[PDB]
Amino acid sequence: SAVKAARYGKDNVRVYKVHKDEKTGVQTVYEMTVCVLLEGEIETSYTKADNSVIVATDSIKNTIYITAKQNPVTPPELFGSILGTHFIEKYNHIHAAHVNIVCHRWTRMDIDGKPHPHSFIRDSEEKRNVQVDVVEGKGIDIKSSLSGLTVLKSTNSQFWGFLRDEYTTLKETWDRILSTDVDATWQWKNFSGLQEVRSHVPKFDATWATAREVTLKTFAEDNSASVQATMYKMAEQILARQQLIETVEYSLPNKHYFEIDLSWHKGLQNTGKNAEVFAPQSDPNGLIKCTVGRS
Amino acid sequence: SAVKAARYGKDNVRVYKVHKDEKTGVQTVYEMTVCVLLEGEIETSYTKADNSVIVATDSIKNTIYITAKQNPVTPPELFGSILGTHFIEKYNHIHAAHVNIVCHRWTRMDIDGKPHPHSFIRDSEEKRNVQVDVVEGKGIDIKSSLSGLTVLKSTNSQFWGFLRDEYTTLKETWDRILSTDVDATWQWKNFSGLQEVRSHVPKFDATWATAREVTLKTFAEDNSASVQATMYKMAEQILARQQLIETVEYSLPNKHYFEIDLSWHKGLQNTGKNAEVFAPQSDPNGLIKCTVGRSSLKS
Amino acid sequence: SAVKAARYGKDNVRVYKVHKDEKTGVQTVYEMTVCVLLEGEIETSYTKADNSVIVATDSIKNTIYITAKQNPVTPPELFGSILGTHFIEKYNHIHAAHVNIVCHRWTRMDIDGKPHPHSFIRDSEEKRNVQVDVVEGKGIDIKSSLSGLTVLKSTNSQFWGFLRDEYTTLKETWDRILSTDVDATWQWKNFSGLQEVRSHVPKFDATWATAREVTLKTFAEDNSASVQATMYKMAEQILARQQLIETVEYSLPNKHYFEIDLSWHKGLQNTGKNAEVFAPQSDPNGLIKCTVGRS
Amino acid sequence: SAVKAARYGKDNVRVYKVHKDEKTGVQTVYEMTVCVLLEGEIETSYTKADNSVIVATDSIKNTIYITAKQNPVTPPELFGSILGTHFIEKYNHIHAAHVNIVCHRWTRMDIDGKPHPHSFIRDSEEKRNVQVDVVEGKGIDIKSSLSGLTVLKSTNSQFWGFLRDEYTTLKETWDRILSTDVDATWQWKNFSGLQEVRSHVPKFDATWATAREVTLKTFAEDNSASVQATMYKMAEQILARQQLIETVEYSLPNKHYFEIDLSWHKGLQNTGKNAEVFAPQSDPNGLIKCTVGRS
């Protein structure tokens, strides 16, 4: 036998950092869950139980904290590039570091119509994530995403004209509820190193904001018979607004709401144009994906 | 052996309802999860295997849907009252209805600075709930609540002067992070029946909004040495703003964020004044509760 | 306003304890999650911000570890009585202690037909719990329980003869799947003190084993058209076999399996007597409870 | 812009199936959660909002139900293969079907020391899964796995000799608790079509029984200072025992149990050799992987 692939590190490292503005006294908090996986010349740990090549997972955790203490943790794309770069430069036998960061929302509270200097609320469970792969001699690859964004529109969605055969029972419809969770990823062009990433820093937060706004606006405004086409349109606009992006990927796990026929009860009318009360379904669910790139 | 207590019904009934304004075209959606439990003369189902006294759980489900179709589903206090009343008024052997409702947020989207007529976002996992007990001859009991409200203040919280003894290692502190999940319940005065609840409809959303606003503003502004104290201040204010409220109950699960000493690494300072990087702890957690009522002192 | 009730303490304290036999070399592990809430003369911490009456929740945590260190952690009924008593005896202004204990399963592995001395597997998410209320001057109240036990029987469950009116659509049946999670709780007669708890120590594990066995057997063997009667039969047998028990409470959250009609597709027969493939429903679910006492 | 990848289908389809023996009267239940994603000439649903190319996800659902009624649902490697093949044989424009199946446990109850004919218990949360890729003109790729298998060993685990630098605080140890959730996957050699898969049916269940037993035994008996070396010994045995397997992949998320220093309290000794009471840590956790192939 032979070790074809190996990775190891620390997962679920919860980090919090506070920034205190020295002029205004305003504090800003950042909270994230970090995962670091290392690759390199570590085969002997598996074949011979040689631990000499192993950077303990505990030390990896310590390094996460130390790195967050000495550097900016935002935007996460930078933080991840800093953390990943550290391991490949500090250890000669380590050739790739894979950093994954989940950012949690802490939104400043508005109290009496003014933003409070140090109180926050966890508004959504929506996350902002980055996946950063730092590979010796192949620069830095970054994938940025938003996830756990949950939306619903009560009309202006249709579904008709789909294939029909002996497996088909679904009726075509010209007015339905469209609800879905939204996972959107945008892959950056490969970066040559840390210096390049740092010089593109302003683009990260701005592109996250664009992807989020385009997603919301297109979803709300598009009167469509095809969820597939709505997602392609979201992706086209993001690619048009940010040249440094190579691809956009969407994954929409639909959430179904069924009409409830109540006619058996005093001929009560609750279907079609009369549909008022629906039954949200927990499962199963339609899942629709696409990865869009540049022609 | 005998049956001392019995209850049964349908749990986890998911319901959505949309309201459409013909005039404006504006649609409003509502979503919730409903549990209805029934009590009455039903011991025979246990003792003798007599199903003749049993209204099938499947039928309790249809009834929820039929009632949602025929009545306003908001405020939830109204709906649960309409729904529990139906059961004791339609089934002679049914003596009490316990209705639990969880309201999910579907908040209207603002697109390009304006409110969208029919798109919504789930802007938080915060819930608005009600527990309605409709008991034959004893009227309607209502507990209203908010839950899943998660907050953090990064400073202006202290904890010192507590009891110290041989089980104690906690150091006193004048500046710490205070984070918690808020659960607040306000118990209404008993209502005689449905018509009484109907007369007070407007107070329901109003008092939900006050309880929330009082919770946030107190948590943000209070410089308190005990969470116990901060919680008591919240309750006092809610009791003072709404007279139909008999008690306010708060339950606060503390979420700890520990300092991380990094001095073993070249003398790096990250504690006290110099603390910037913390470790949030998933468990264990402090848990603080209180039920606050009206005082019998006339002055 | 006035404080009507107040309680506070430490929740979610995870505890693991190992027992090592020096002769046999066999090891035994216990894992649980503990919650301790205290009551007493603590009003002024709410009303006057007076912390002098506050035993820090952090010191409650220390006390749990210290207590597990110096005492037996099994049966949890005993352990919880010890932990609750300690607080009302150590602090003058504390007059009630509420202890909740969740025990997790670590079942000894069997390797090559033989029980391994020190390897364990989590063989189920089923829990053994205790709730112990130690109230000064009023003894010790113990509720024991099992939860998270999920069962299913493929036939020999019926449901007919139920009330039918204009809100009914359910068709009666004489054959159906019965699946449910089981929550069973047995309330011990009040104990005057720790000495009395200590003298009945052997009764606890045995009653739990009895409660578990009675539950599975009756569930498996009963061919009933009433889940209510089935659980009433369960309670009777437990009450009969253990005199120190005052009440038995069952909570059965049903799990529905719907028949799927496929006759639109080539005359496929999959209903009634021909039903083979079912759709498990995630929600909603029937919920049935009862508390059974002695005449 | 161009569609670079696209896939869509139905997720979280819950399926239950009962097998009744008329002779013996003994029943056997299977329950699983299925996901089917399709790929093909479907770009136009995205670019042109053309649904005529869309096999409705609702019909994909129907199909999984009809397929389960008409065929054996065990072993899952077989069922997955039949279901994936169906799409590429029925539709001109679909060239790949990706089927994921998660099997849940329904273990036959032993009542009075005899197997019960129609009563089951969900012993563990452990799963047996399959991922089948059926791609037009490229055969059928099957990956089998077990997951959610949780184990603990109270001694006979060590960790010393790792790299130590200015980021390292972990002390070396010769006796510690080792606990993990296990995820093991084995990838079969490419199968040419359904008939060849059908020909190896017996091997599927047997290879799953083997991977499970090797994982438990090696974990229980190995006294290693390397989780890495233990997992490598596991993969070796599996590869040695099944020639039709190309690779074995293990993913082990460590679950740490910290020692609690209690000496500050009246000199209590609960460290090193006196350690009896530990604190289970929910996060963070080490995560170790490797993929082991043949030389």
Tab-separated table of C-alpha atoms in Angstrom, chain B residues 21 25 27 32 36 55 70 72 83 86 96-97 103 117 120 174 185 193 211 215 223 234-235 239 256 281 286 290:
chain	number	residue	atom	x	y	z
B	21	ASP	CA	-54.021	43.447	-0.957
B	25	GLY	CA	-50.840	44.465	-4.768
B	27	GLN	CA	-48.561	40.688	-0.170
B	32	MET	CA	-45.598	29.345	12.084
B	36	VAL	CA	-52.335	21.611	20.003
B	55	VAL	CA	-60.538	12.983	18.089
B	70	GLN	CA	-61.184	31.126	8.141
B	72	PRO	CA	-56.798	35.997	11.119
B	83	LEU	CA	-58.212	27.708	18.032
B	86	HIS	CA	-62.974	25.782	18.993
B	96	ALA	CA	-58.981	21.931	28.012
B	97	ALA	CA	-56.998	22.956	24.907
B	103	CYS	CA	-43.808	32.550	14.729
B	117	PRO	CA	-44.376	44.032	-2.419
B	120	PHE	CA	-39.049	38.388	2.153
B	174	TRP	CA	-14.378	45.439	36.004
B	185	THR	CA	-42.157	35.669	28.714
B	193	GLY	CA	-63.451	34.270	26.924
B	211	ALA	CA	-40.673	44.024	25.577
B	215	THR	CA	-34.682	44.294	26.426
B	223	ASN	CA	-23.523	49.307	33.420
B	234	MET	CA	-36.036	45.023	32.149
B	235	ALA	CA	-38.978	43.313	33.865
B	239	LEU	CA	-44.669	45.690	34.026
B	256	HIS	CA	-18.603	32.993	27.980
B	281	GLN	CA	-16.684	28.887	24.904
B	286	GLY	CA	-24.161	30.281	33.382
B	290	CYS	CA	-36.294	35.299	37.552
